[PDB]
């Protein structure tokens, strides 16, 4: 993948919006780029709700290493499109824009695909209640006096 930093994600988002690309004769300011990186950090932090949200592998920058741009985002290869399409949707209003229908649809699809595997992982069944017997067909448990399920 040719998108390997937070600024790379931001550049992909701007190109997707059609504001700035490698072919355009006019470009956006580095301050606007840093603002877009702040937006990206905020969006990913709101997704990853301290571990109880969308798990992606994103790495949050620290103040010790100064530029958040330039840091590898750490996403797997299949989260980049979702991340930068959602980023384009989020940062469109700054430039008096409105993301096109295709961008919005790809953002929805990408976010759902991002959360699919985590949803499958969290679809877990609870253990038996503490008041449920283990039956008598469980000869080992009933010989060891496990007449009722442990629970918890």
């Amino acid at each position: 993948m040719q998108i390997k930093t937070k600024g790379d994600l931001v550049r992909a988002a701007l190109r997707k919006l059609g504001v700035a690309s490698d072919a355009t004769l006019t470009d956006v300011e580095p301050q606007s780029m840093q603002d877009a990186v702040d937006d990206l950090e905020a969006m990913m932090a709101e997704w990853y709700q301290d571990g109880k949200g969308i798990i992606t592998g994103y790495v949050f920058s620290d103040d010790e290493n100064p530029p958040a741009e330039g840091d590898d985002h750490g996403l797997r290869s299949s989260a980049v499109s979702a991340v930068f399409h959602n980023l384009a949707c989020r940062i469109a209003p700054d430039y008096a824009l409105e993301a096109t229908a295709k961008i919005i649809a790809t953002a929805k699809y990408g976010k759902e695909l991002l959360y699919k595997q985590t949803a499958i992982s969290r679809a877990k069944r609870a253990p038996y209640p503490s008041r449920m017997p283990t039956g008598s067909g469980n000869s080992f448990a009933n010989l060891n006096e496990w007449h009722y399920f442990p629970g918890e």
Binding site: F140, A141, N144, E145
Partner: protein, 53 residues
């Protein structure tokens, strides 16, 4: 004599006992059976209480 008959080999099936060992400590170490629900090779930690003070 020169009785050049036909030679055999005979292996008798009485054994020569050689090993006779005793196990005194294992006959004094008391045996326990753990009350575990499922039969798993996973960590078999059974917790038992200690006399109160």
């Amino acid at each position: 004599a020169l009785n050049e008959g036909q030679i055999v080999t005979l292996a008798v099936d009485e054994i020569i006992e050689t090993i006779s060992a005793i196990t005194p400590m294992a006959q004094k170490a008391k045996k326990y059976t753990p009350p575990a629900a499922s039969m798993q090779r996973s960590s078999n930690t059974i917790w038992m209480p200690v006399e109160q003070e």
